[PDB]
Amino acid sequence: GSHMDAFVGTWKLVSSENFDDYMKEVGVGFATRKVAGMAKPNMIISVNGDVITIKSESTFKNTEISFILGQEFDEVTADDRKVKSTITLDGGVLVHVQKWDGKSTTIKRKREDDKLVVECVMKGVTSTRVYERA
Ligand SMILES: COC(=O)c1c(C(F)F)nc(C(F)(F)F)c(C(=O)O)c1CC(C)C
Fold first, then answer.
1. 41 CA distance to ligand 1 centroid (A)?
2. Which residues pair with 100 in a beta bridge?
3. Closest atom of ligand 1 to CA, residue 41
4. Which domains does the chain have, with CATH numbers?
């Protein structure tokens, strides 16, 4: 077992706040904001050895990343940014930093009660997206 295993499973989005504003700050265009903002993703998190896989599945896109904690990787995001990503596990929180074009956004994933809470930050704008087990 590992501490990280409280994230493993299949999660469904139950609430979102300020996601349109977060996407605007990231630079997402109008049409993608509208369709992606309507999405109700499931988040599938699995661990096999040192490799963590996180999939976001929705009517908009199916996206999947696999990574080792602390080891940078190239990621194509749902809005088609080509970013350099590093994910670490710091005090029980998965911290995902994406770098591109001299910009940075950080996505934190935390367990709180029976929720998995995703906090997304860009240039002072936060979105909070709350998931529960499927
Ligand atoms: C900048 O926004 C994104 O990168 C993004 C977009 C959007 F860019 F298209 N759409 C979606 C989804 F709702 F469509 F799934 C997600 C998501 O996984 O929730 C994300 C990831 C984000 C919550 C950190």
1. 9
2. 103
3. 15
4. 9-133 (2.40.128.20)
Give a three-class secondary structure readout of the chain: CCHHHHHCEEEEEEEEECHHHHHHHHCCCHHHHHHHHHCCCEEEEEEECCEEEEEEECCCCEEEEEEECCCCEEEECCCCCEEEEEEEEECCEEEEEEEECCEEEEEEEEEECCEEEEEEEECCEEEEEEEEEC
Ligand 1 site, residue 78, Cβ cutoff 6 A: yes
Closest C-alpha among 56, 70, 65, 46 to residue 118: 56
The answer to whether 129 is a known ligand-binding residue is yes
Experimental method used, please?
X-ray
Atom of ligand 1 nearest to the CA of 81: 4
Q: Is the CB of 28 under 6 A from ligand 1?
A: yes
Distance 80 CA to ligand 1 centre (A): 10
Of 21, 43, 76, 77, the residue with max ligand 1 atoms within 8 A of its CB, to mutate for a pocket test, comes to: 77
Quick one: resolution in A? 1.0
The β-bridge partners of 103 are 100
